[PDB]
Amino acid sequence: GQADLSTRRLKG
Amino acid sequence: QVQLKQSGPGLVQPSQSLSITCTVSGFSLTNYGVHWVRQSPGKGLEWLGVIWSGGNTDYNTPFTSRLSINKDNSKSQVFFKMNSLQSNDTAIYYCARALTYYDYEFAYWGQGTLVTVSAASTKGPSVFPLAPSSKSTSGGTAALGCLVKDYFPEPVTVSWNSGALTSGVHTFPAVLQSSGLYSLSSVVTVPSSSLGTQTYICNVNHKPSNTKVDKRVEPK
Amino acid sequence: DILLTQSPVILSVSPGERVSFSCRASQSIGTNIHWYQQRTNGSPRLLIKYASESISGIPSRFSGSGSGTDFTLSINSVESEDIADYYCQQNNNWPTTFGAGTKLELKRTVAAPSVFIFPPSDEQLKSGTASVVCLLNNFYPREAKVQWKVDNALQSGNSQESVTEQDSKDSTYSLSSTLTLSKADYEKHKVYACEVTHQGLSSPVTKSFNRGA
Ligand SMILES: *[C@@H]1O[C@H](CO)[C@@H](O)[C@H](O)[C@H]1NC(C)=O
């Protein structure tokens, strides 16, 4: 649901 | 040929300020506004403000007092400056241009600038080979890689054979170790028989510490 | 500010299927909505502007509809390269605001991981640390178990996992497990094993080495 720093994608 | 290139990712200390340059091409700052948008864990995509063709600025409400946007038309440069950064200002910062001069339909984006807010020091990584072996083969296919260890802050770019090798590459998301340093691996699978003919090099670049390492990876 | 709500947060579909992204606004915004695609390591890419209008270079399979508060981004025949996050943006009211996004993942057939193990390099052993890496490559679905054993002792708490986002070509994931040891501990033991469990394996696969060979 939230933006992930390590991924540059949404993660949960 | 419309493009926006931003300055490199970096670390900023708590309460210190953030500066990013957006250099544009394929159009003129005298004809288009440039917008700034960030993307953070806390708030996702968030519009920050804009500098218009004629130099006027609009800033999003929570940024009125700590944001300054300037430009140099001749040098095609837009300058973003934000004061008093806190941890939750850690985000990827983007410049962007709309389709039409007056609008907000963001058709062209900079590559982004990852900004980490922390009191820590920048540290470049060590690169270690993940060597192909018998315990690393699979029906004529060998896996090999690079372990990019103990750096701060994100991000680190990895490529293989100077951009030429892309098929079968996986570069994993960095994980934060208990030391508070990051670590990631990048792997690639190649034909076993090419291990004797082809060289394999991971090109590691940790821009915040200006550390560039090319690690040759060989069978042990 | 206008709140945009995107539902669901996660969409999982098979290739060639139709997929709709929903975006709802907290008050009427006319048709003043734009949609974006964000791939891994990518900047947002504009797909649709003003609810339904086309953008140069965007494949025809992307379209949008809606007006007032209820909007839809549609992909009529989804492709593997559509694996991304999708965002909506409103600009009827200052300031322009963005929805929180919807993740698009693809279904595919079960694919068992290929498993590879890597001893720490002699280079790293000089630094006083040992990393043992276990790679699980090109598998589906995402769920997998990696168990580490050293001389038959179960390892716990001393490994970390990272998983790639879905591959845009073959829709698989890859996973790395790194077991981290002091050099002293490493040189004290012989057999290093990672056991992998996955839906596509009829029984766990173990990859091991003996320190030395
Ligand atoms: C950060 O913290 C401030 C309060 O200090 C808060 O108003 C803001 O919404 C927080 N989140 C982000 C992403 O800035």
Author numbering:
A (entry chain E): 1 to 12
B (entry chain B): 1 to 220
C (entry chain A): 1 to 213
Which sentences did the original study use to describe this structure?
Next, we placed bromine at the meta position (3), again to test whether it could interact with the hydroxyl of Tyr87. Moreover, greater disorder was observed in the side chain of Arg8 of one of the meditopes in the asymmetric unit (B factor of 64.8 Å2 compared with 51.2 Å2). The binding affinity was also reduced.
Multiple strategies have been developed to modify monoclonal antibodies, including chemical conjugation and protein engineering. Recently, we identified a cyclic, 12-amino-acid peptide that binds in a cavity formed by all four IgG domains of the cetuximab Fab. Owing to the location of the binding site within the Fab, we have termed the peptide a meditope (medi-, middle, + -tope, place). Based on our observations, the peptide–Fab interaction does not affect antigen binding. Herein, multiple crystal structures of meditope peptide derivatives incorporating natural and unnatural amino acids bound to the cetuximab Fab domain are presented.
